[PDB]
């Protein structure tokens, strides 16, 4: 199954269907993270800004937390913890057991994946990316991100 097909059986942290975020004819930029990673937590406000920014409007920007996977809080526990944080414009898909992360061989956080508009995985990046690297990826999945590492 493609990533969007898999995700279309999933809810967000507020219980709505994840599928509402997966707009057609747009690539999807996905940030994988966990509650136990303080770098990831420090970057939630950043991702929320991007998701709301017109520069990112050509892509779907979503994040995935994976209850019960890699020592993430269990299903229910995760959402209760996350409800104390305040990022109301950030989509957080909850993938119980980390199905998509396992399919994509994601083992470190944060990591990012770029899914094409046809649902195919185009790029996986281990670790953090900056706003310029994220914009470069939504424009060209084969962008050279290293040339912007020290920007």
From Swiss-Prot:
S-S bridge residues: 37-40
Phenotype upon loss of function: Hyperpiliated and hyperadherent.
Superkingdom of this protein's organism: Bacteria
Domain Thioredoxin: residue ranges: 1-143
Recorded family membership: In the N-terminal section; belongs to the thioredoxin family.
Protein task: Has an important function as a repair enzyme for proteins that have been inactivated by oxidation. Catalyzes the reversible oxidation-reduction of methionine sulfoxide in proteins to methionine.
Domain notes: Possesses 2 methionine sulfoxide reductase domains (A/MsrA and B/MsrB) and 1 N-terminal thioredoxin domain.
Protein name stated in the entry: Peptide methionine sulfoxide reductase MsrA/MsrB
Name of the gene: msrAB
Residue window of the full protein shown: 32 to 182 of 522
């Amino acid at each position: 199954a493609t990533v969007p097909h898999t995700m279309s059986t999933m809810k967000t942290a507020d219980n709505r269907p994840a599928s509402v975020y997966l707009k057609k004819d747009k690539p999807t930029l996905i940030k994988f993270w966990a509650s136990w990673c303080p770098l990831c937590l420090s970057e939630l406000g950043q991702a929320e800004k991007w998701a709301q920014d017109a520069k990112f409007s050509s892509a779907n920007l979503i994040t995935v937390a994976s209850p019960g996977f890699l020592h993430e809080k269990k299903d229910g526990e995760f959402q209760k913890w996350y409800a104390g944080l305040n990022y109301p414009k950030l989509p957080v898909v909850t993938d119980n057991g980390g199905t998509i992360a396992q399919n994509l061989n994601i083992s470190v956080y944060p990591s990012w994946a770029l899914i094409g508009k046809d649902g195919d995985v185009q790029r996986i990046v281990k670790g953090s990316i900056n706003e310029a690297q994220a914009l470069a990826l939504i424009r060209n999945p084969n962008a050279d991100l290293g040339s912007l590492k020290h920007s």
